[PDB]
Short mmCIF file of C-alpha atoms in Angstrom, two decimals:
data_model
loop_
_atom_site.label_atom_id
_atom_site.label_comp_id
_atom_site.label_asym_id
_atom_site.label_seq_id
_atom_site.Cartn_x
_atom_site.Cartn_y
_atom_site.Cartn_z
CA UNK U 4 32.57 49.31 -133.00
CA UNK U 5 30.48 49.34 -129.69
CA UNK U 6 28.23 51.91 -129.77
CA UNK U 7 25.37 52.93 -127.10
CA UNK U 8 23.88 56.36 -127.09
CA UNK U 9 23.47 58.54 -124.68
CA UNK U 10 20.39 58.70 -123.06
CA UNK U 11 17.22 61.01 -124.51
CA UNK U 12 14.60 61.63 -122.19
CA UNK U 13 11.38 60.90 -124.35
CA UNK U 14 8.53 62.00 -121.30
CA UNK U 15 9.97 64.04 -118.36
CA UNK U 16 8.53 63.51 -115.04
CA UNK U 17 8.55 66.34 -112.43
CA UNK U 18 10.95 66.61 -109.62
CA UNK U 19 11.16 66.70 -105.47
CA UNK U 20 7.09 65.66 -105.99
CA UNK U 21 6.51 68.64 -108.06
CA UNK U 22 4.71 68.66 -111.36
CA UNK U 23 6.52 68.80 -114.55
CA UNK U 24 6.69 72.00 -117.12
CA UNK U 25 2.84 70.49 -117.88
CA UNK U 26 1.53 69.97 -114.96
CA UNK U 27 2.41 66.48 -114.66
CA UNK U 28 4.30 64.67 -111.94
CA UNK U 29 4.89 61.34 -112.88
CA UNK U 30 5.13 59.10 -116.03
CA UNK U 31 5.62 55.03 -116.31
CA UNK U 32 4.98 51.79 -118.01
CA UNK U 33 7.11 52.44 -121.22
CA UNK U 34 5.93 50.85 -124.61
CA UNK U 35 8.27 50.59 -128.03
CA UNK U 36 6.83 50.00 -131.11
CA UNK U 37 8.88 49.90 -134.40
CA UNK U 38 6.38 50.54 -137.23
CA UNK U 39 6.26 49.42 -140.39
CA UNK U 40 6.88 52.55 -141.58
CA UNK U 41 10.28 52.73 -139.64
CA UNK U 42 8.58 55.01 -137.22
CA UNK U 43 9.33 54.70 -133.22
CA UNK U 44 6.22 54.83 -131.01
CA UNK U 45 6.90 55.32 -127.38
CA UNK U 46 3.74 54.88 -124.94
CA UNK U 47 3.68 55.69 -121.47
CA UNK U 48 1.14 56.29 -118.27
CA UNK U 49 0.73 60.10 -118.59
CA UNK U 50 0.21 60.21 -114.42
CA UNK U 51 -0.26 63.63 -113.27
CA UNK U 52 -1.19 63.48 -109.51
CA UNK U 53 1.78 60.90 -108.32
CA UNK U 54 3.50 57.99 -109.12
CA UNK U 55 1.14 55.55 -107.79
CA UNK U 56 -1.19 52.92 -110.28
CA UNK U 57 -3.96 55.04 -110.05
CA UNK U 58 -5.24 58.73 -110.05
CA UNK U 59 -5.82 61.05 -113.15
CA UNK U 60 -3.82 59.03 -115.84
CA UNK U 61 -3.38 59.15 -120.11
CA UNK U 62 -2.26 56.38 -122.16
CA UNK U 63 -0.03 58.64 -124.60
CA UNK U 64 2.33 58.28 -127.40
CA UNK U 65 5.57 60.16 -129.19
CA UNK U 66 6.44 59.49 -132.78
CA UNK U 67 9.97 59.53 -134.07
CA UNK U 68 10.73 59.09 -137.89
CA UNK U 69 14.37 59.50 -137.32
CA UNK U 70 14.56 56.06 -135.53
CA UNK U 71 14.90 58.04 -131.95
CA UNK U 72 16.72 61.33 -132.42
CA UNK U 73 14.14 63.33 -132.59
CA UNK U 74 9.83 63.34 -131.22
CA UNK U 75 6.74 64.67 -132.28
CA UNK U 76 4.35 66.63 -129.45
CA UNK U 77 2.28 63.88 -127.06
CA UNK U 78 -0.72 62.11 -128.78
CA UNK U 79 -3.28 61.65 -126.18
CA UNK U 80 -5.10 57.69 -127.00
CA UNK U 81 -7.30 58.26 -124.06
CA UNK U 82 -7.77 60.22 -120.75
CA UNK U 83 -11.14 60.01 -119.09
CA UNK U 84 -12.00 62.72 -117.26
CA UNK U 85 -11.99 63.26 -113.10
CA UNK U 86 -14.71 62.70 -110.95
CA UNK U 87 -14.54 66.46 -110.22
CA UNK U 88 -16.54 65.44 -106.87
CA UNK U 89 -14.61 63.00 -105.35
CA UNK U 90 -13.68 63.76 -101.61
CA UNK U 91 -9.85 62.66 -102.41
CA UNK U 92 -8.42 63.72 -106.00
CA UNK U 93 -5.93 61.57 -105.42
CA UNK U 94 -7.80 58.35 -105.93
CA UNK U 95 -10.92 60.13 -107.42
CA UNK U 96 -10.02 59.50 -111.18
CA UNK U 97 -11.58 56.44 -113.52
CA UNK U 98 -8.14 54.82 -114.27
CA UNK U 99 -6.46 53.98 -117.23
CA UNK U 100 -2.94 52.46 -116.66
CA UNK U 101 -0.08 49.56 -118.37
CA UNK U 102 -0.54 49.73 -121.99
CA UNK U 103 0.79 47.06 -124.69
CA UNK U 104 1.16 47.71 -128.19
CA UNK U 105 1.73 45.91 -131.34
CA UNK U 106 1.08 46.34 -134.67
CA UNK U 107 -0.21 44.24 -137.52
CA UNK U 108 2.45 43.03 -140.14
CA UNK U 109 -0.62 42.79 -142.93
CA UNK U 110 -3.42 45.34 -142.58
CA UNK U 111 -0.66 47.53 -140.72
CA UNK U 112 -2.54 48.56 -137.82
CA UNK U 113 -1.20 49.49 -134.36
CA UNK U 114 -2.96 48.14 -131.33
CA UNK U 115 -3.01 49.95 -127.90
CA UNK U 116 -4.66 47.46 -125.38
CA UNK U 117 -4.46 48.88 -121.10
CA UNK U 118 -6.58 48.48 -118.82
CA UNK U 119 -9.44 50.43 -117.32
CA UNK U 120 -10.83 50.52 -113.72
CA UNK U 121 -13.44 52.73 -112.69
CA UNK U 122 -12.93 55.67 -109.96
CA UNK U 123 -11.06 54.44 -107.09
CA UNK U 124 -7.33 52.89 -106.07
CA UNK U 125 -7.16 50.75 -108.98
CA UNK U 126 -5.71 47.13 -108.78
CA UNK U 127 -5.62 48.24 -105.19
CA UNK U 128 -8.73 48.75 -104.87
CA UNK U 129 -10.46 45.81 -106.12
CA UNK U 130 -13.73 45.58 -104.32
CA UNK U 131 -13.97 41.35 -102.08
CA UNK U 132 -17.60 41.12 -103.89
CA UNK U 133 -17.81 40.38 -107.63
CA UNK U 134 -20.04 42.70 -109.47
CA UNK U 135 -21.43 41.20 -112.45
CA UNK U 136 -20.06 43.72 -115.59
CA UNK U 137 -21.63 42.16 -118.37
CA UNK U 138 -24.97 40.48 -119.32
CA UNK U 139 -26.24 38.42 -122.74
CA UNK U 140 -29.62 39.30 -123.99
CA UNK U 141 -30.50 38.09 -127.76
CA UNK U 142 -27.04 36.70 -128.45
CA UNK U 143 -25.95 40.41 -127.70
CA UNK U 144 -23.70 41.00 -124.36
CA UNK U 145 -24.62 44.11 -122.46
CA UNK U 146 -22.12 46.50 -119.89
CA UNK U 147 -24.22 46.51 -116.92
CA UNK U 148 -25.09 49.73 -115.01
CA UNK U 149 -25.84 49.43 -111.00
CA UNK U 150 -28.29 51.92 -109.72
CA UNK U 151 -28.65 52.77 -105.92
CA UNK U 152 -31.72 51.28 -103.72
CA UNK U 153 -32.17 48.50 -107.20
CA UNK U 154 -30.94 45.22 -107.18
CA UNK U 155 -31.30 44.23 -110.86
CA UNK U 156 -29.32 45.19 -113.65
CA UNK U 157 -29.28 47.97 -116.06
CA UNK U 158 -28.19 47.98 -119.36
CA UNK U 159 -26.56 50.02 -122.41
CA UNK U 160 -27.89 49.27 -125.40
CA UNK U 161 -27.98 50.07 -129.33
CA UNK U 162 -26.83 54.43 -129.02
CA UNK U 163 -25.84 54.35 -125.39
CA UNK U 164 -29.89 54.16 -124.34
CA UNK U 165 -30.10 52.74 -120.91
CA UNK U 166 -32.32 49.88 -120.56
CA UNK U 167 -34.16 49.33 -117.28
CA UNK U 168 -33.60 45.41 -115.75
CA UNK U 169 -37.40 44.62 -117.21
CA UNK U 170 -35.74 45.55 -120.42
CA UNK U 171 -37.60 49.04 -121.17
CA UNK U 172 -36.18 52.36 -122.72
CA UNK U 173 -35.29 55.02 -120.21
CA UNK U 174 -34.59 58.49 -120.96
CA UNK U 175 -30.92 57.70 -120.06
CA UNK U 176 -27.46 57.09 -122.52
CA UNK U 177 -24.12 56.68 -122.20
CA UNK U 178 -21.78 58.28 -124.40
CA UNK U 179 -20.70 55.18 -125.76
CA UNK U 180 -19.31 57.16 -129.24
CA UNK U 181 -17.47 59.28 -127.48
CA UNK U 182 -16.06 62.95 -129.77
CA UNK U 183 -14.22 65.26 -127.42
CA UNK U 184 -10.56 64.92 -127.90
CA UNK U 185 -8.59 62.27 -125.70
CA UNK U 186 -12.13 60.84 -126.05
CA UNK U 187 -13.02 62.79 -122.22
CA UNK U 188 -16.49 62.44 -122.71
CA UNK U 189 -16.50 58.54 -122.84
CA UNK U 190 -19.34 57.21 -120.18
CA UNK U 191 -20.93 60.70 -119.74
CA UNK U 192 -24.19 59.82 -118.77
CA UNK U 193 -27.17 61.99 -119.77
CA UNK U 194 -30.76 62.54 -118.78
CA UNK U 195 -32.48 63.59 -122.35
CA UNK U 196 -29.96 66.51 -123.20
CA UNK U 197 -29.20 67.06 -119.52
CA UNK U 198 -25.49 66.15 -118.56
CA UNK U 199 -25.68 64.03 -115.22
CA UNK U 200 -22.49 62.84 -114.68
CA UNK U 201 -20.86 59.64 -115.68
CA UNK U 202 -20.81 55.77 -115.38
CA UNK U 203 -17.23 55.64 -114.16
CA UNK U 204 -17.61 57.88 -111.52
CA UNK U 205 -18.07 55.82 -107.95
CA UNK U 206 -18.37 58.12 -105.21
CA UNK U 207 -20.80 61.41 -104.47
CA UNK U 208 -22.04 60.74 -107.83
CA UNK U 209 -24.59 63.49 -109.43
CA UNK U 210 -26.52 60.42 -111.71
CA UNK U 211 -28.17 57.77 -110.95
CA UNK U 212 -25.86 54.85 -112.77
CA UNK U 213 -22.19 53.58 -112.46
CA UNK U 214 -20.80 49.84 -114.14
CA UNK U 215 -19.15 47.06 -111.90
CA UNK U 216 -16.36 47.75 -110.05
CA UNK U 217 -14.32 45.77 -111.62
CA UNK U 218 -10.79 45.16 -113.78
CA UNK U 219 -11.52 46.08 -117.29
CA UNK U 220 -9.24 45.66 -120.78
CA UNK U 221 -9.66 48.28 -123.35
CA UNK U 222 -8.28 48.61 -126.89
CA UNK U 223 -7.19 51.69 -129.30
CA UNK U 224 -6.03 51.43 -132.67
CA UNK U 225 -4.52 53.95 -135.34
CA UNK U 226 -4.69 53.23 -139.26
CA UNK U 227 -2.23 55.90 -139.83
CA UNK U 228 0.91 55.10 -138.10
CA UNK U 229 0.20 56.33 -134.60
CA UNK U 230 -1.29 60.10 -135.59
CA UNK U 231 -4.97 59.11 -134.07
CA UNK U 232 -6.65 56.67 -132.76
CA UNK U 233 -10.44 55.41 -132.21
CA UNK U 234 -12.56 55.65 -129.64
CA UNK U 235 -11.88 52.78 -126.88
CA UNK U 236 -13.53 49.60 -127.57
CA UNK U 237 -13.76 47.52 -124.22
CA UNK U 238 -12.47 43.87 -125.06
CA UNK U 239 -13.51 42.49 -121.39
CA UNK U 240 -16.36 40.27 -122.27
CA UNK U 241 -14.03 38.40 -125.19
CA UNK U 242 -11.59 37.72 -122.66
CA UNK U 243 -12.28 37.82 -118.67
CA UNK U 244 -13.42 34.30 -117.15
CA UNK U 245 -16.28 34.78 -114.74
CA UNK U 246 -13.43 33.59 -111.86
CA UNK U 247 -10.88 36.49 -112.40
CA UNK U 248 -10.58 38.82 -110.05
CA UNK U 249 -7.62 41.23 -111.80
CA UNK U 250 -7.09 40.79 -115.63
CA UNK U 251 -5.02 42.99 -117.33
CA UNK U 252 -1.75 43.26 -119.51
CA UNK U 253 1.90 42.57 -118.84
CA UNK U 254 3.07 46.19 -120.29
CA UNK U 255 5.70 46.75 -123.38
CA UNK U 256 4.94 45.74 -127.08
CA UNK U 257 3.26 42.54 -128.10
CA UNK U 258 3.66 40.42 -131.10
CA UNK U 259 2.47 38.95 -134.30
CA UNK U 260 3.73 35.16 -134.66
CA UNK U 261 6.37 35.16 -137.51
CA UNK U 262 5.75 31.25 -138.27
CA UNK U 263 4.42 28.07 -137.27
CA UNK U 264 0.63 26.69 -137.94
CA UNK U 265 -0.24 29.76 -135.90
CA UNK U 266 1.47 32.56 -137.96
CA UNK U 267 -0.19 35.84 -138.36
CA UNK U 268 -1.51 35.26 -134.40
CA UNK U 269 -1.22 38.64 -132.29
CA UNK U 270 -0.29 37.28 -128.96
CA UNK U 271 -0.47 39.73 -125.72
CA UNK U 272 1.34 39.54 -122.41
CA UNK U 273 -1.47 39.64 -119.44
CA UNK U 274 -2.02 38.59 -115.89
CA UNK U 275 -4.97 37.99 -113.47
CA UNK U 276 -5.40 37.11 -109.98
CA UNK U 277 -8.44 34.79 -108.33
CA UNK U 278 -10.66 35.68 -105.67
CA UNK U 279 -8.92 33.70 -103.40
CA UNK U 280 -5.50 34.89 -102.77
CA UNK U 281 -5.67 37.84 -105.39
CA UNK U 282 -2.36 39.88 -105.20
CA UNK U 283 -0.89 37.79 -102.01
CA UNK U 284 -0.73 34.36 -103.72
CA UNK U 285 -2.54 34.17 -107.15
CA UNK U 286 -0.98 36.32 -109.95
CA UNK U 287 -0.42 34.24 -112.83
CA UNK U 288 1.14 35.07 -116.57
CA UNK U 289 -0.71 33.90 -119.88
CA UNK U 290 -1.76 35.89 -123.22
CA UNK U 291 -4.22 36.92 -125.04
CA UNK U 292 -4.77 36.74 -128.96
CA UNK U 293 -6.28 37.24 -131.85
CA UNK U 294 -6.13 35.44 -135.33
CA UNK U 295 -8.91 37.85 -136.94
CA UNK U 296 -6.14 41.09 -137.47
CA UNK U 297 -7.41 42.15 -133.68
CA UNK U 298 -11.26 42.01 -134.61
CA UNK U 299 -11.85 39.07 -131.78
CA UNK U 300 -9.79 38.33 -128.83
CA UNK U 301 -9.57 35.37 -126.74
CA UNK U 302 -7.41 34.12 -123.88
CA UNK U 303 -4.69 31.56 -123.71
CA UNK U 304 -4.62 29.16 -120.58
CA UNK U 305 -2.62 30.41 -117.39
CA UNK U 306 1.30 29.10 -116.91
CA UNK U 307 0.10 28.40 -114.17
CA UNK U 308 -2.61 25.98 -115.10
CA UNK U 309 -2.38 22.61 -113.81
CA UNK U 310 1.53 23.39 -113.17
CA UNK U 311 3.26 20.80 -110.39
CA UNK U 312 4.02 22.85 -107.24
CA UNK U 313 6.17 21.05 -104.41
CA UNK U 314 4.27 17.60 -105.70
CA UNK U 315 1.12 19.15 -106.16
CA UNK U 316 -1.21 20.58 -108.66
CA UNK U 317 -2.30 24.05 -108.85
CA UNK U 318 -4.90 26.19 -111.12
CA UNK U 319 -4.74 30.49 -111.54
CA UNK U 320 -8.49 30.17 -110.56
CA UNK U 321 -7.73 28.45 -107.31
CA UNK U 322 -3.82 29.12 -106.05
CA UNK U 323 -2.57 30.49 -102.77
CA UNK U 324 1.25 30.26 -103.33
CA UNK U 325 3.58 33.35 -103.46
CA UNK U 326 6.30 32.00 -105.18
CA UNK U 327 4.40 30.32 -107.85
CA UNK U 328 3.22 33.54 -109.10
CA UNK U 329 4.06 34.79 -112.55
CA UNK U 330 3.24 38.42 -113.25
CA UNK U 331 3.91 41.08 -116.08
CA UNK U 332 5.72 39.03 -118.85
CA UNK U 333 6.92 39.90 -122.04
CA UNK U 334 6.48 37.14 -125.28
CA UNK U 335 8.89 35.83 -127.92
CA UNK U 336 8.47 33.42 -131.08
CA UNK U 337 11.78 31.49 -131.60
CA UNK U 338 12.27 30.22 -135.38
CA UNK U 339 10.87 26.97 -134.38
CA UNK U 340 7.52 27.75 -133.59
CA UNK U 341 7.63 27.93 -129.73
CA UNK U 342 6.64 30.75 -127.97
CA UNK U 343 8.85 32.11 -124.74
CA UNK U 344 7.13 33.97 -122.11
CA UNK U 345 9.29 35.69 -119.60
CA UNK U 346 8.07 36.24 -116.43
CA UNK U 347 8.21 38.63 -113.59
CA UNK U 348 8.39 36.61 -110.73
CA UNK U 349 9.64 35.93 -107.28
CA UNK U 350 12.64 33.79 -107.35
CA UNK U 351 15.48 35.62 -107.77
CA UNK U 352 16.02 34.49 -110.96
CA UNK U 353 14.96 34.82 -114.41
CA UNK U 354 11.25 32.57 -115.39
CA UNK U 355 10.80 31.19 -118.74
CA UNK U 356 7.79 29.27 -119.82
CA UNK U 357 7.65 27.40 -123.26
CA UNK U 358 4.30 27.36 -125.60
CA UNK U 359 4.30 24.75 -128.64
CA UNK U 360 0.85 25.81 -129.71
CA UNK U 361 0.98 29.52 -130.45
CA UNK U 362 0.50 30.26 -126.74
CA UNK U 363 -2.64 28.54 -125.89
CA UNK U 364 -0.98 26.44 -123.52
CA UNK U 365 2.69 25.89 -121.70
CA UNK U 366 4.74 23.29 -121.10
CA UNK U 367 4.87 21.88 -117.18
CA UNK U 368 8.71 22.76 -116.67
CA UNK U 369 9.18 26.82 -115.99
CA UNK U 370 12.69 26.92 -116.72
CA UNK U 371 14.85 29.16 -114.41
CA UNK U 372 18.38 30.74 -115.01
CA UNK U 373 20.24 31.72 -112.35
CA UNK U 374 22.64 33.63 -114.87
CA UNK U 375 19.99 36.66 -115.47
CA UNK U 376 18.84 38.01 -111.87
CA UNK U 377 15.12 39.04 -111.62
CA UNK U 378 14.52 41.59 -108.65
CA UNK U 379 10.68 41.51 -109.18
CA UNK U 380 10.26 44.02 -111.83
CA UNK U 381 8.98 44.14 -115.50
CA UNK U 382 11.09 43.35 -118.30
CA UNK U 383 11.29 42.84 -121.99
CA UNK U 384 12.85 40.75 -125.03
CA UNK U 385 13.00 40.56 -128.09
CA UNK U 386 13.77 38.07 -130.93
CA UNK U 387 16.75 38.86 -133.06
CA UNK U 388 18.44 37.85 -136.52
CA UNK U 389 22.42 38.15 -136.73
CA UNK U 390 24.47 36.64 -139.30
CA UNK U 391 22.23 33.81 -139.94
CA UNK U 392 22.08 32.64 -136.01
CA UNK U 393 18.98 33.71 -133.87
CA UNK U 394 19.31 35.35 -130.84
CA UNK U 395 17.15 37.25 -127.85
CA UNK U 396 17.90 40.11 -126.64
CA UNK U 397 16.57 40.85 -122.80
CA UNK U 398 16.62 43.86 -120.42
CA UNK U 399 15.56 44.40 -116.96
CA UNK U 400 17.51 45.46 -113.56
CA UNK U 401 20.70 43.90 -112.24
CA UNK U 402 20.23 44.65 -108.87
CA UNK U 403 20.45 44.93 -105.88
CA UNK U 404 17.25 46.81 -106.17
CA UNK U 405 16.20 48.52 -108.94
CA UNK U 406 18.54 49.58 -110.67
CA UNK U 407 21.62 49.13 -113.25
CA UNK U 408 20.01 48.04 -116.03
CA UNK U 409 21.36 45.56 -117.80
CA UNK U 410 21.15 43.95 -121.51
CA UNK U 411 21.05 40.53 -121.66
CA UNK U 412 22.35 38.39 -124.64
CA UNK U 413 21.03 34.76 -125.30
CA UNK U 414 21.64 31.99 -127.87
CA UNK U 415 18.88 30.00 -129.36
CA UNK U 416 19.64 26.89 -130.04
CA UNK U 417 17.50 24.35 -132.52
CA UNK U 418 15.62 23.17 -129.61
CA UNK U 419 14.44 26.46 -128.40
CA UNK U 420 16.65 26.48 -125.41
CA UNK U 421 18.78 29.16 -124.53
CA UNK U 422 22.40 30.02 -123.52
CA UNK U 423 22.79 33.10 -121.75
CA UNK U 424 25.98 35.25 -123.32
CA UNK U 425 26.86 38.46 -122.57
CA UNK U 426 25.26 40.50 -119.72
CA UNK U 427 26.10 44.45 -120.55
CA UNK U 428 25.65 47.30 -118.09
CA UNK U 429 23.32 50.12 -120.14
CA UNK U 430 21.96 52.47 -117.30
CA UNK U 431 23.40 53.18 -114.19
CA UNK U 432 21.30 53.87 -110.94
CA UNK U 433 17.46 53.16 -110.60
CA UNK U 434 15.97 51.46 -113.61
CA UNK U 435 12.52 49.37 -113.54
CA UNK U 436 10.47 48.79 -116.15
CA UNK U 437 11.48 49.09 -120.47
CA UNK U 438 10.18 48.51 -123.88
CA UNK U 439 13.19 46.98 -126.49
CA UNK U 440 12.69 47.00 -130.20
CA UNK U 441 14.86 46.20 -133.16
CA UNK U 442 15.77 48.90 -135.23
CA UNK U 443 17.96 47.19 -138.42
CA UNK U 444 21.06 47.76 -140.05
CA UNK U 445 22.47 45.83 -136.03
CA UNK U 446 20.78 48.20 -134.71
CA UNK U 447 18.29 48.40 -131.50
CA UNK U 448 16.32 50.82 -129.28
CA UNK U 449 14.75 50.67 -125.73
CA UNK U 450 12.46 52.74 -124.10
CA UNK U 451 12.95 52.74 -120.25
CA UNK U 452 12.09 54.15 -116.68
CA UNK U 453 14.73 55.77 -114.61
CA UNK U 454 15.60 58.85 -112.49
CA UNK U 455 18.51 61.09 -111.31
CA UNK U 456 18.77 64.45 -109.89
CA UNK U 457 15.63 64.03 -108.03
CA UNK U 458 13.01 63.27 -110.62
CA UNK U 459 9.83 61.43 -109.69
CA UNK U 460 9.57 58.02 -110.51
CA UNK U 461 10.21 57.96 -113.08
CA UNK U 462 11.37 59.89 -116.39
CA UNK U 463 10.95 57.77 -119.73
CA UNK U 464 14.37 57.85 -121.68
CA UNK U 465 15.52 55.84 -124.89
CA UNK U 466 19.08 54.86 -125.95
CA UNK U 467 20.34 52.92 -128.78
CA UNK U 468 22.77 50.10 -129.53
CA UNK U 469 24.48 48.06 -131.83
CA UNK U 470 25.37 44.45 -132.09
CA UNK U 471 29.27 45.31 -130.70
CA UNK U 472 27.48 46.60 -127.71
CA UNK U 473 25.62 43.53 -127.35
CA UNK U 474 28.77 40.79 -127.54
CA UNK U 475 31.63 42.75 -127.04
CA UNK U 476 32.76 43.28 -123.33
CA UNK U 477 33.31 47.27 -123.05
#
């Protein structure tokens, strides 16, 4: 009958702020993909000088093909290499951090989309002037390179050459097709054969060029069920208004609308902030998709978006109001067509907006329920099949803080609304952010942060369940 696994820790963080048996301290953001194949991908931040969103961080992977008893050794998807100048290690890393992955019901590929910020604190450490990243020349759009005591813009162009703003060769590239392994070498900038240093790099820099400061979205993919992956292709410019301040993804695993006029869509979960309240009063859910199998992106409108706050109107570009933010999110297609988008947010409570159009744009009432707490953390759902009736299936913390996770049961009805269940009890103690996935045969899986005996936050472990779990009271 009711079954629930113990827990398996997938990627072990150190303890008592120690590193782990490799070096590593800390590991978070947990991503579950069920592939095609019936294989079990779980991503995570690799973060090996502390827990914080920044530092020297991996986006990484583990494959199972024995639906979660046993992993394969860490596949690295990316890890740029360390300013190894930087006055302050601890912030003296180009960052890499949240990843989101889906894959591709038809051509089978697996996406890894995170986002990228050059050396420095990260999201904490966005910069209060915009720096231009990008810039159009022939139809063709351009990363921009800054170069001390210049005011105009440099370019990378066709092989990495570095374009002067007058638009002449210089005897500079970027290694834009990066080769050494965990793809290291990506935004080494060279002087003829001479290694400089690189564009990522921000402070005592040893060359002459670094891009914007800015919040950047990158994208990996694998052709061969998670084993390797290509070099990052930065999917910015298809995606990043000229207003946003922060853009980047609401981490966990993405998905592929089943039906509707906009099946086939690859929808995922992301949130920006403006320049006017950035983190204090302007983070705001949407998504981002793609109907070309993940060739072209673009963005969905914000929740947030003309949405009726206390009798008046507000826009993610323009918004100063804490409690109308909407953060991380996780997305669900119900049978009718509508598309759920659960939000992290700051009521108390759980946040659900409704899409009618594949996502592009949401409904004006945010629908709250009081019977599934939210303690301002990350969370994720899934859509589910059982007997012929359709179902979600949500996790997150139960509180007080976070901790006891808890499994959350809801009914769809034929309207798309919901009718919250059964709440179960699956992890005792801290628990923040986790990755569910469906497994078959009743079965699921979840990937998710906790820690015990001292650990640093946090260690990535994965249980499984069954359907008597779900709706039967233990």
């Amino acid at each position: 009958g009711a079954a629930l696994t113990e827990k398996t820790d997938i990627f072990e963080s150190g303890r008592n702020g120690k590193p782990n048996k490799d070096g590593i301290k800390s590991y978070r953001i947990p991503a579950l993909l069920k592939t095609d194949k019936g294989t079990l991908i779980a991503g995570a931040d690799e973060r090996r000088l502390h827990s914080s969103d920044w530092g020297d961080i991996g986006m990484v992977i583990r494959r199972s093909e024995d639906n979660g008893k046993t992993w394969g050794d860490r596949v690295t998807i990316t890890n740029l290499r360390d300013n190894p100048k930087a006055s302050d290690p601890s912030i003296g890393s180009p960052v890499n951090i949240d990843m989101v992955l889906v894959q591709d019901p038809e051509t089978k590929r697996i996406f890894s989309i995170y986002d990228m910020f050059p050396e420095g604190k990260g999201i904490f450490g966005m910069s209060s002037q915009k720096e231009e990243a990008y810039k159009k020349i022939d139809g063709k759009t351009y990363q921009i390179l800054y170069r001390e005591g210049e005011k105009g813009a440099y370019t990378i162009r066709e092989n990495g050459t570095v374009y002067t703003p007058d638009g002449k060769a210089t005897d500079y590239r970027v290694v834009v097709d990066p080769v050494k392994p965990a793809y290291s070498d990506k935004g080494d900038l060279y002087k003829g054969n001479q290694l400089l240093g690189n564009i990522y790099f921000t402070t005592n820099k040893t060359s002459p060029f670094r891009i914007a400061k800015d919040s950047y979205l990158w994208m990996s993919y694998s052709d061969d069920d998670g084993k390797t992956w290509s070099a990052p292709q930065d999917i910015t410019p298809m995606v990043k208004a000229d207003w946003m301040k922060f853009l980047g993804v609401g981490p966990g695993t993405g998905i592929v609308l089943r039906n509707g006029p906009h099946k086939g869509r690859i929808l995922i979960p992301v949130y920006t902030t403006n320049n006017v309240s950035h983190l204090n009063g302007s983070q705001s859910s949407r998504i981002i998709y793609s109907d070309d199998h993940g060739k072209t992106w673009h963005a969905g409108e914000a929740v947030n978006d003309n949405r009726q706050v206390d009798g008046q109107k507000i826009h993610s570009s323009t918004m100063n109001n804490r409690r109308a933010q909407n953060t991380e999110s996780t997305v669900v297609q119900l049978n009718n067509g509508d598309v759920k988008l659960f939000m992290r947010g700051l009521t108390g409570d759980l946040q659900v907006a409704t899409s009618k159009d594949g996502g592009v744009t949401w409904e004006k009432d945010i629908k709250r329920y009081p019977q599934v707490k939210d303690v301002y953390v990350q969370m994720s759902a899934i859509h589910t099949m059982h007997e012929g009736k359709e179902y979600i299936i949500l996790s997150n913390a139960g509180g007080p803080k976070r901790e006891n996770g808890m499994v959350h049961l809801a009914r769809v009805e034929e309207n798309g609304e919901l009718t919250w269940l059964k709440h179960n009890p699956i992890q005792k103690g801290e628990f923040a952010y986790n990755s569910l996935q469906e497994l078959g045969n009743g079965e699921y899986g979840i990937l998710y942060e906790h820690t015990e005996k001292g650990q640093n936050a946090y260690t990535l472990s994965f249980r499984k369940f069954n359907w008597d779990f779900l709706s039967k009271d233990l």
